C-alpha cells in the first residue's frame, strides 16, 4: 500500500499546510484525519503562517487566533472622514444647519498632522449634531468563542477640533452590546470643551476583560458650537476608528 | 568551477561549484573537507532532477511556468523531491515543491484529499466542521 505525502515528516507537512488559506486549514484540512486535526489545532502550523506573512511582532494564548485577528485587523467604521458623505452613518441628528463635510484645513482651523491621508472632516452647527454606527462583530469576522473567551481588545479612537474663531463642544459615547443589544460596557466622555486654539485632539479607549456576550459595538459622537451662530462653527470630527487588536 | 557528487547508489555526478551552491548543505561542503562528496540520503534518479532544477536556476507567489512542467512527476517522486530539497537545503526547490503539493489540496473536500493522498479516515466520532474557528 502506497502512502507518500502523509508519511511526510511533520516540519515538511507543516510547510505544505502553511501554503493553504487559514480558512481551508480550519474547515477542510482539520477534517482530513486525526494527525491533521492535531496539527491544525497546534501552535507550530500557525506560528509558521505568522512568520511567513511578516506578522510576528516562543509562546501564545493561541497562534491561530493571533493569525486571524492580525489578518482581519481593520477599521470597522464606514466612511470615517466624510469621503462618502454621511453614508454609512446612522441615527444622524442634524442640529442647526446639520453636519457639513469640509476639506482640511478648515476655515480658521489647524492641519491634520497625525495622518495626511485624512483630507476631510464633518463640521457641526449651533445645535447638537450626532451620528452613529453599530458594528456587528461576527459579521466582521470575530466569532462567538473568540468574543466570549479571548475577549480581544476592542480599540476605539476619535479626532476632534474646533475653529480658532468660535467656542465648541464635543461628545463621544461607545457601547459594547449584547446579542439582544443590552449594554455591557460604556465609555462616555461627557461634554468636552474643544481646544481654544483649534488643535486636533484624539480620544482613545480600549475595552478589555469585558465579560462574555459582546456582539456589537455602538459608536456615537457629536458636536456643536457654544456661540450659537448660523453656519458650521461647532466641533469638527474625523478619522474615527474601531478595531479588534490581535 | 567544477565538483563531483556521489549519490546513495554509487553513481557520480559532476557539476559546477556555481549551480551546486544553491544547495546550502553542500555549499557548506567547500570548507570541512575540500573523492566526491557523499550523499547517503539521495538516490541517483533524484539527484539528477535536483541538479537539473539547479542548472535552470543558476543565477536568478504564482510558481514559474517551467517548474510546473518540471514538477509534472508522479506523486512518489514529488515526495522524494521535497525530501531531497530539504536534505540538500535548496530553499527554492522546497518552496516550489511544497507549493505544488499544497495546490493539490487547495479547495478540496476532506474525502477528496484522503483519496488523492491515500490517507485513511482516522475518525472515531462525528466529524464536526469548524468555520473561521
What region does A190 belong to: left with phi over 0, alpha with psi -120 to 50, or beta?
left
Structure-determination technique: X-ray
C-alpha span between B129 and A29 (Å, rounded): 10
Per the CB < 8 A criterion, the answer to whether A128 and A224 are in contact is yes
Contacting residues for B74 by C-beta, under 8 A, at least 6 apart: none
Contact of B91 with chain A, judged by CB distance below 8 Å, is answered with no
Pull the grid cell for residue B56.
535552470
Q: Residue A23: which domain range?
A: 1-62
Give one word for A91, left, alpha or beta, with left for phi > 0 and alpha for psi -120 to 50: left
In whole angstroms, how far apart are CA A111 and each of A82, A118, A119, A237, B59? Answer: 16, 10, 9, 13, 50
The CATH code of the domain that includes B126 is 3.30.710.10
Outline where A58-99 has alpha helix (H): 63-72
Q: Which residue of A has its CA nearest to B97?
A: A16
Q: Which chain B residues are within 8 Å of A27, Cβ to Cβ?
A: 129-131
The span from the first CA to the last CA of chain B, in angstroms, equals 54
Give which of A22, A30, A32, A139 to mutate to test B binding, by max B Cβ within 10 Å: A32
Supply the DSSP symbol for A159.
E
CA pair distance B66, B26, nearest whole angstrom: 25
Q: Is A164 marked as binding a ligand? A: yes
Distance of CA A77 to the CA centre of its chain: 7
The residue behind cell 480620544 is A203
Put simply, whether B41 touches A (Cβ < 8 Å) is no
Residues recorded for chain A? 246
Q: What resolution, expressed in A, was reported for this entry?
A: 2.4
Total domains present in chain A: 2
Residue ending a domain, choose from A41, A62, A83: A62
Count of domains for chain B: 1
3-state secondary structure of A158: strand
| Residue A103, all three cell numbers | 476639506
Structural domain span for residue B8: 1-133
Tell me if A143 is assigned to a ligand binding site. no
Q: How far is CA B100 from the centre of its chain?
A: 10
Please tell me whether A46 is known to bind a ligand: no
Phi, psi (deg, nearest 5) at residue A189: -85, -25
Of B83, B129, B133, Cβ closest to residue A31: B129
- For residues A2 and A43, membership in a common domain is answered with yes
Q: How far is the C-alpha of A14 from the C-alpha of A109, rounded, in Å?
A: 55
Under 8 Å between Cβ of A45 and A29: no
**Same domain flag for A56 and A85:** no
CATH at A49: 1.20.1280.50
Domain end, chosen from A44, A62, A80, is at: A62
DSSP B24-88: HHHHTTSSS----EE-TT--HHHHHHHHHHHTTSS------HHHHHHT---HHHHHHHHHHHHHH
Amino acid at each position: 500500500a502506497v502512502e507518500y505525502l502523509a508519511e511526510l515528516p511533520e516540519p515538511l507537512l507543516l510547510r505544505v499546510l502553511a501554503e493553504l488559506p487559514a480558512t481551508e486549514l480550519v474547515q477542510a484540512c482539520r477534517l482530513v484525519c486525526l494527525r491533521w486535526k492535531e496539527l491544525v489545532d497546534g501552535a507550530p502550523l500557525w506560528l509558521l503562517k505568522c512568520q511567513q506573512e511578516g506578522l510576528v511582532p516562543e509562546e501564545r494564548d493561541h497562534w491561530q487566533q493571533f493569525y486571524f485577528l492580525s489578518k482581519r485587523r481593520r477599521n470597522l467604521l464606514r466612511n470615517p472622514c466624510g469621503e462618502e458623505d454621511l453614508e454609512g452613518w446612522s441615527d444622524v441628528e442634524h442640529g442647526g444647519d446639520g453636519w457639513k463635510v469640509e476639506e482640511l484645513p478648515g476655515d480658521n482651523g489647524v492641519e491634520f498632522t497625525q495622518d495626511d491621508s485624512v483630507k476631510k472632516y464633518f463640521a457641526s452647527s449651533f445645535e447638537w449634531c450626532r451620528k452613529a454606527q453599530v458594528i456587528d462583530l461576527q459579521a466582521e469576522g470575530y466569532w462567538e468563542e473568540l468574543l466570549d473567551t479571548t475577549q480581544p481588545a476592542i480599540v476605539v479612537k476619535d479626532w476632534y477640533s474646533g475653529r480658532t474663531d468660535a467656542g465648541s463642544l464635543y461628545e463621544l459615547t461607545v457601547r459594547l452590546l449584547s446579542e439582544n443589544e443590552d449594554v455591557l460596557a460604556e465609555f462616555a466622555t461627557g461634554q468636552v470643551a474643544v481646544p481654544e486654539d483649534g488643535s486636533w485632539m484624539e480620544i482613545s479607549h480600549t475595552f478589555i476583560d469585558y465579560g462574555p456576550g459582546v456582539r456589537f459595538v455602538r459608536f456615537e459622537h457629536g458636536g456643536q458650537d457654544s456661540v450659537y451662530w448660523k453656519g458650521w462653527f461647532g466641533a469638527r470630527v474625523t478619522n474615527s476608528s474601531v478595531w479588534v487588536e490581535p | 568551477p567544477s565538483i563531483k557528487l556521489q549519490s546513495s547508489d554509487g553513481e557520480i555526478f559532476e557539476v559546477d561549484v556555481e549551480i551546486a551552491k544553491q544547495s546550502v548543505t553542500i555549499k557548506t561542503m567547500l570548507e570541512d573537507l575540500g573523492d566526491p562528496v557523499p550523499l547517503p540520503n539521495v538516490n541517483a534518479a533524484i539527484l539528477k532532477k535536483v541538479i537539473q532544477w539547479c542548472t535552470h536556476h543558476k543565477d536568478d507567489d504564482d510558481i514559474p511556468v517551467w517548474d510546473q512542467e518540471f514538477l509534472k512527476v508522479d506523486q512518489g517522486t514529488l515526495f522524494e523531491l521535497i525530501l531531497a530539497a530539504n536534505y540538500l537545503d535548496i530553499k527554492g526547490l522546497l518552496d516550489v515543491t511544497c507549493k505544488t503539493v499544497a495546490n493539490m489540496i487547495k479547495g478540496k473536500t476532506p474525502e477528496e484529499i484522503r483519496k488523492t493522498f491515500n490517507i485513511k479516515n482516522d475518525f472515531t466520532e462525528e466529524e464536526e466542521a469548524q468555520v473561521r474557528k
